[PDB]
From a paper:
A near atomic resolution crystal structure (2.0 Å) of wild-type KirBac3.1 was determined, providing an accurate starting model for simulations. Steered molecular dynamics simulations, in which K+ ions are moved from the transmembrane cavity to the cytosol, were carried out on the pore of KirBac3.1 (residues 33–138 of the 2.0 Å structure) embedded in a POPC membrane separating saline reservoirs. Over the duration of the simulations the narrowness of the shallow intracellular opening did not prevent K+ passing through. The simulations report free-energy barriers at the Tyr132 collar of 6 kJ mol−1 for wild type and 1 kJ mol−1 for the disulfide-linked mutant. These values fall within the range expected for thermal fluctuations and are too low to impair K+ flux. Within the pore cavity, K+ diffuses with a coordination number of approximately six. A fleeting reduction in the number of solvating water molecules to three or four occurs as the ion passes through the collar of tyrosine side chains but is almost immediately replenished. Transient interactions between K+ and the Tyr132-hydroxyl groups occur after the ions pass the low energetic barrier near the center of the tyrosine aromatic ring. The retention of a kernel of water molecules means the free-energy barrier to permeation at the constriction is not prohibitive.
Residue numbers in the entry:
A (entry chain A), B (entry chain A), C (entry chain A), D (entry chain A): 12 to 28, 33 to 298
Amino acid sequence: PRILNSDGSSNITRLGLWLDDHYHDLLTVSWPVFITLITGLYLVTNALFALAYLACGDVIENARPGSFTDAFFFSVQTMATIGYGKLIPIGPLANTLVTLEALCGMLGLAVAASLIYARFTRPTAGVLFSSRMVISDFEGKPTLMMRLANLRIEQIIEADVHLVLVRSEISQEGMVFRRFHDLTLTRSRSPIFSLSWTVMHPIDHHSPIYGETDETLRNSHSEFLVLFTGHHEAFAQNVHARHAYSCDEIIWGGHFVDVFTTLPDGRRALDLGKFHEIAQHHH
Amino acid sequence: PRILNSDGSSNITRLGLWLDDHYHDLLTVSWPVFITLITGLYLVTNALFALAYLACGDVIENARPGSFTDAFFFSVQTMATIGYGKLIPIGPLANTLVTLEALCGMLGLAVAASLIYARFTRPTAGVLFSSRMVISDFEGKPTLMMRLANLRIEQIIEADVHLVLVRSEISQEGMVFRRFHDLTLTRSRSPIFSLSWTVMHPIDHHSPIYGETDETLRNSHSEFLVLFTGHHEAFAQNVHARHAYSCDEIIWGGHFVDVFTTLPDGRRALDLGKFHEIAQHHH
Amino acid sequence: PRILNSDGSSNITRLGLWLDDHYHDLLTVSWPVFITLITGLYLVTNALFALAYLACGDVIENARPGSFTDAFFFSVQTMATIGYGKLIPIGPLANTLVTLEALCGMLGLAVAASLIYARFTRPTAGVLFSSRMVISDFEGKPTLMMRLANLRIEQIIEADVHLVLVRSEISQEGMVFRRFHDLTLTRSRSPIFSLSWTVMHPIDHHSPIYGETDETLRNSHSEFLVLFTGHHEAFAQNVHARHAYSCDEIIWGGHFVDVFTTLPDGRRALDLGKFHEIAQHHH
Amino acid sequence: PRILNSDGSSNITRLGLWLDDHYHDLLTVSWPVFITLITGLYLVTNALFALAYLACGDVIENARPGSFTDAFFFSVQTMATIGYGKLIPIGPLANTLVTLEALCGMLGLAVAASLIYARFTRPTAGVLFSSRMVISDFEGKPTLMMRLANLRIEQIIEADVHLVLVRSEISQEGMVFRRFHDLTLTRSRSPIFSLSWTVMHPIDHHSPIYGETDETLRNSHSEFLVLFTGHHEAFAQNVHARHAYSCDEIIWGGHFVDVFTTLPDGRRALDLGKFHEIAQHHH
Ligand SMILES: O=C(O)CCP(=O)(CCC(=O)O)CCC(=O)O
Ligand SMILES: O=C(O)CCP(=O)(CCC(=O)O)CCC(=O)O
Ligand SMILES: O=C(O)CCP(=O)(CCC(=O)O)CCC(=O)O
Ligand SMILES: O=C(O)CCP(=O)(CCC(=O)O)CCC(=O)O
Ligand SMILES: [Ba+2]
Ligand SMILES: [Cl-]
Ligand SMILES: [Cl-]
Ligand SMILES: [Cl-]
Ligand SMILES: [Cl-]
Ligand SMILES: [K+]
Ligand SMILES: [K+]
Ligand SMILES: [K+]
Ligand SMILES: [K+]
Ligand SMILES: [K+]
Ligand SMILES: [K+]
Ligand SMILES: [K+]
Ligand SMILES: [K+]
Ligand SMILES: [K+]
Ligand SMILES: [K+]
Ligand SMILES: [K+]
Ligand SMILES: [K+]
Ligand SMILES: [K+]
Ligand SMILES: [K+]
Ligand SMILES: [K+]
């Protein structure tokens, strides 16, 4: 049973212990729920203004006396600023409510637009993670690797990547705990991430997985979390993506197949058809 | 008497020495004050336009001659763009004012929406701090610790934490002063803060509190300030939270109770009911 | 054939393998396409509301019975909240649709404004790159250099620069690959970039181009990518710019001509007429 | 003649060499110019729509035939969506223009609001710089110092400061140039800047001003630039401030007067009346 899922979310059960987090919740409910809440508030406030006009008397021209329906639709036409001109206010009180309601309609528009824009400007990174990792020799050292691909044509600026080991350990005091290790990489920063990036942790005598095997990684229930971040040109915003691997998803001795190549007519090409392809020696 | 309160604010009295900081003040006044200011400006500018129309003569059809009331509500219906159609402008001057007022109504909407959105997009971190710190042995060293919990389901990216000692000191010149020490941590950066994070300062021979006791920390009026920051997924914005501890809130020999556990049916769980629980040996 | 073009884009052919990336695409299509899409949606939704009213019967006063045209323009006048007052709704159903349509008109405005603002707030850096690099002796070492100029009067805060070597290499395992080297600079950070900045990589015995010649750089198909980033005062936003050089664009022995000078009357001046000027000794 | 002014701007004369930078210029022109440009565009586009209606014939009810004035104000009432109801469109062509104009009015509102909000959300840091620097002994070393004060009640998160020496130098090749040195500080980062911060560069044997005097600093025309940056709580935005000092503004042997004190009744206080006060020994 894996703790981190492939998408980087955790299976940990949160035991725990309406408006406690309202701004957050307005941004994170589904769009159908969000639009329902806006609509609900919009209908509720029109009904309240409708009652306000009735409480003043018959102050709506061409409205049936005592009709909530006519007062409601006049409220709509006032708050939305349609102002057809058949239902119009009569007297100081009605005209004062109109002045207040028009302000409420404008303020409600500002609020709704603010929330919509805050929901919109949360772009995704558009990054693809290799389905597996590998451990194989590179530049004289066994090296843990995975790789990333850009699925968009715009580039990502000052891109950072982390390979994070999560495992259970024992302190010299005998205390058992899970902790994370942000592994040392050959490249942790790419000034411009463009097409594809192979992320590499050389396993030298300082690596937390130095001397480890498939068996000893499972014994410590080791998992690997990958975080990618950068400033995406398409949005002028920071983006981030995550992924996680289990011990079952490390190919010991594996070598990623090159995705960069030179076509027969000479021009260099990227072939993401090979992105998840890994070569192994079969004995 | 503590200088820093538990929430990270200071009790220092600012001795010191209307529109001096207007943008800042518009964003930091309470919402009732903010809405009152918008409403006030909205009513003031309609009155000024009302006087403008009267200064042109009887240029509002169906308006009583010389009536400020009728000119005021016509101004409202024009600036808010309701345009019921009973009060309408007559002649070039009135129609020019309408053209200007409609622009003012649209610009005022843009301004109000800009301020509302700037007030909205200041999210809180949703982080909980342990009510105490502890000092106890971990990995062979006495270690100062506190911990954090995420109260939301979304994660925080590239999370940073600081444990800051603030105390009074004496230079070799004999000058007395208070300064801060950003303490060295075992982990200062969590690429993905998800559920709970124990922040640890090992007290080695380079620590500014090496050899210190409860007595000597009080003698220097030592306090501890914690800053958490990170990029919150729910908002695509950086968030931050702070907390402070006094010497009374350090449990020497204390050990935090585990909040992570494995339920009987095997699945891993987080129990924040234990978040503030600390174990001590009683002699 | 260069891989990186002068503007920092790559000539690599992306082999590969409607609403799959809709938010991104709405922000990156050309403005004519964007406005066409907004207009299209705006006309489509008015037609749908027009059919809605007709499906209710003859519920639009002064509208010809069964006329899609009259129902369409009444829908426009309702969604845009013009409300001339000739075409008005009749009965509960029509007035309910008006209430829904006004909400749709306001929500569509919020959506369009959110997208327009997200497209707008992606400012350019306003930085000029020297058309060439040079390698010449400075402070006792052969040093690779290029330079930047600010084309605006506002300054750029916490400016970072990278000189990135990209070349083909061979590992001791015999694997061939292209990788990047973020070269060590004398100054990688300028707290305030104001007018012009000469970026320098001293070629010491640790430099990846130590001992290299024009010939050996071409043999490894070496290219140089420059990234500039910083917080632009004019926008209160991070900006970035990029540029790339080939081996043909390095002047060995070249010295940039000073762009800073003191005018005859004593005041210091910047002369960007000399920005691309390089001096060479001719033997 | 100083190059950097006290406010951090430079006196360097930019020799050099309508819509070349339009987005930048819309955000940086004065507010009167900005509002004039919006108004101008608003009047120009209404005139063009007015001509459009006239080109269709007498398609505006209650409008005088051939009157540009009546067509202009009908355009205003349509683009602003006032729709009084006296001037109304007649026929397919006029009603099509209305549909287009309403869209233009909504798009123009989105554009204006986007620009206004981009102009608004550029907050100032609210930081005060000491009018002078000092050089005096601290913790066994001559130390260059200045200090900062927060003029607001909200705090600044992850605050960074730079003390930057700018001076003219000579390389071993004999080349003369001005360069900057970002000086090593005792504290360059304050996790929470709250009230006042004394910034200190210890002048040890590695300092670029080690062994320097008032005379030798003037000979190299040395100036000192200070940059402050941080995440301001009031805005949830990064802010920055700058200041510069000349050799005339360094008090050799000076000691800043404490701004923190304990009032007679015991509570700690900040007295910014002393912020610019410096003590000197008079011989
Ligand atoms: O790390 C990798 O796997 C690729 C490094 P590059 O510099 C190789 C480019 C080529 O072979 O043509 C690509 C870096 C990037 O696209 O971001
Ligand atoms: O530092 C801690 O107290 C927890 C470290 P983790 O890696 C432990 C996870 C587990 O025991 O299942 C949790 C890190 C996080 O949630 O951000
Ligand atoms: O690196 C350069 O080429 C210029 C360094 P500066 O400090 C020279 C200023 C002068 O000669 O007057 C300019 C730095 C900047 O404008 O950002
Ligand atoms: O650097 C300074 O001059 C002040 C350091 P502090 O920690 C002194 C606080 C006191 O004396 O009460 C203040 C730091 C801050 O306000 O940001
Ligand atoms: Ba309207
Ligand atoms: Cl740890
Ligand atoms: Cl200090
Ligand atoms: Cl690499
Ligand atoms: Cl330099
Ligand atoms: K409206
Ligand atoms: K209207
Ligand atoms: K009307
Ligand atoms: K409105
Ligand atoms: K924003
Ligand atoms: K309006
Ligand atoms: K409006
Ligand atoms: K932003
Ligand atoms: K509208
Ligand atoms: K109307
Ligand atoms: K009418
Ligand atoms: K509207
Ligand atoms: K708006
Ligand atoms: K409008
Ligand atoms: K509008």
